[PDB]
């Protein structure tokens, strides 16, 4: 357990690799069922305001 | 998941050969043992109540009987009316006992 809500917006690039352009983790909140912040792992850069399902998560 | 060894000046490695191989059929189709009842009732007749319809090939595989071998069995049953086939190109098709 660890829920699984409709959509999610990226709060901020939690740090990571980088140099120019960001593979590695990000902290996201779930858009509805708010106030669970977890770090989901993704490929590729992002930008804040991108909206994504992190689908099942669990 | 792995392959085999590797070649030798020659040469090749391989590794694999199989299960085997019996249900040679058409010989056992003529003589009474598989032809008389058993193959029809057990394989063909017993399988059907669990699932009313099944493809011939699937039947082929579970039953472990040759596609030709129970083509013939199927045909006999069809004449009896115990089974009804449908059609398809690849000799595949569907096998049913009764509609109901």
């Amino acid at each position: 357990m660890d829920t699984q809500v409709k959509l999610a917006v990226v709060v901020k690039v939690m740090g990571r690799t980088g140099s120019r352009g960001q593979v590695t983790q990000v902290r996201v909140k779930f858009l509805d069922d708010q106030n669970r912040l977890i770090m989901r792992n993704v490929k590729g850069p992002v930008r804040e305001g991108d909206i994504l399902t992190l689908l099942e998560s669990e | 998941p792995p392959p085999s060894s590797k070649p030798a000046k020659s040469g090749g490695g391989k590794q694999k050969k199989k299960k085997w191989s019996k249900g040679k059929q058409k010989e056992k189709v003529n003589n009474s043992v598989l032809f008389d009842k058993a193959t029809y009732d057990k394989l063909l007749s017993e399988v059907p109540k669990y699932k009313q319809i099944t493809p011939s090939v699937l039947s082929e595989r579970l039953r472990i009987n040759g596609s030709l071998a129970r083509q013939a069995i199927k045909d006999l049953e069809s004449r009896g009316a115990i089974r009804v086939v449908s059609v398809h190109s690849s000799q595949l098709i569907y096998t049913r006992a009764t509609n109901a």
């Binding site: - | 030798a8 000046k9 020659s10 040469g11």
Partner: protein, 76 residues
Amino acid sequence: FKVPDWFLNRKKDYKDGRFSQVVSNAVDMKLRDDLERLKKIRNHRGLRHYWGVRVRGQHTKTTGRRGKTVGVSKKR
């Protein structure tokens, strides 16, 4: 059908006899008679068998590992 050599009985060894058919152990057995053959006759075919090189022409460029042994380390 049939098959019979004929011509005038003149020719010694080897001929054809009229397409041996036949086939099978008589043909493998005669295929030896035929290998043996060319060799005493001293033709370019026989001469190749004694040598062990493939007779009806390959690329050679590679491939022929079979023809007279396994890959045999470097060379000299």
